[PDB]
Amino acid sequence: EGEMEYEEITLERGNSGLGFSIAGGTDNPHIGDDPSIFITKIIPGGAAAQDGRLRVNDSILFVNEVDVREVTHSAAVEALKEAGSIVRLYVMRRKPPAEKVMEIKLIKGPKGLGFSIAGGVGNQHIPGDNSIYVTKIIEGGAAHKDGRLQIGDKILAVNSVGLEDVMHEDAVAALKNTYDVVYLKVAKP
Ligand SMILES: N[C@@H](CCC(=O)N[C@@H](CS)C(=O)NCC(=O)O)C(=O)O
């Protein structure tokens, strides 16, 4: 965590470009006196989002064979626009904070587990991430009464069924196909 890491990410240009916005350069450094080109936004439903590797705050070092470590903002946009259909990026990032994985046992109340979900493949809740997220916890519901499950939590598994890269519909189906006592694997940020 916090340690610098490097990654090769190749993207195929969609109808709406590569699906990310950038800032920085020697023109207007984004962090102090650091002239690096930074990802500021991952566009929902775009190429970078579907590929799920690129992250906000990644520094682009190379675009194909073009060195963008110390260039202007304009020279960066040009390099990306001119890179063709298949774009080879070499990036650097500080490793993100690790998440707490936790198994939670819930007994249904009169109205179920007491929480709602969003996310899924082709229905991303955060751009670049196919995970199933908790979006609402119902007042006085089972989850609320437990006190562990929170907004923004990830559901990784329902009993023995994993929810890694599944459709939203499949996540709802897994939660429905349960008995009264449900075991959930959850990730907390
Ligand atoms: N491990 C290889 C590949 C790592 C890599 O992707 N290198 C960067 C710069 S050190 C690069 O120029 N990649 C884009 C390219 O394929 O030319 C190397 O030593 O160059």
Author numbering: 58 to 246
What does the study report here?
The crystal structures obtained are in the same tetragonal space group with a very similar unit cell. The PDZ1 domain binding cleft is ordered, but the PDZ2 domain shows disorder in both the βA-βB loop and αA-helix regions. Weaker and more diffuse electron density is encountered for these segments, which is consistent with disorder around the PDZ2 peptide binding cleft, including the GLGF motif (GLGF). The cofactor-reduced GSH (L-γ-glutamyl-L-cysteinyl-glycine) was used in all but the final protein purification step at a millimolar concentration (in the lysis buffer). If GSH is present, the F118/Y147 side chains are in contact with the amide planes of GSH (GSH), and GSH moieties such as the thiol and carboxylate will be presented to the PDZ2 binding cleft. It is likely, therefore, that GSH effectively modifies the surface of PDZ1 such that an αB(PDZ2)-βD-βE(PDZ1) interface is enhanced.
The disks large homolog 4 MAGUK, commonly known as SAP-90 or PSD-95, is very abundant in the PSD and, in rats, has also been found at axonal juxtaparanodes adjacent to nodes of Ranvier. Knock-down studies have shown that the PSD-95 protein plays an important role in the integrity of synapses by anchoring receptors. The binding cleft for the peptide ligand lies between the βB-strand and the long αB-α-helix of each domain.
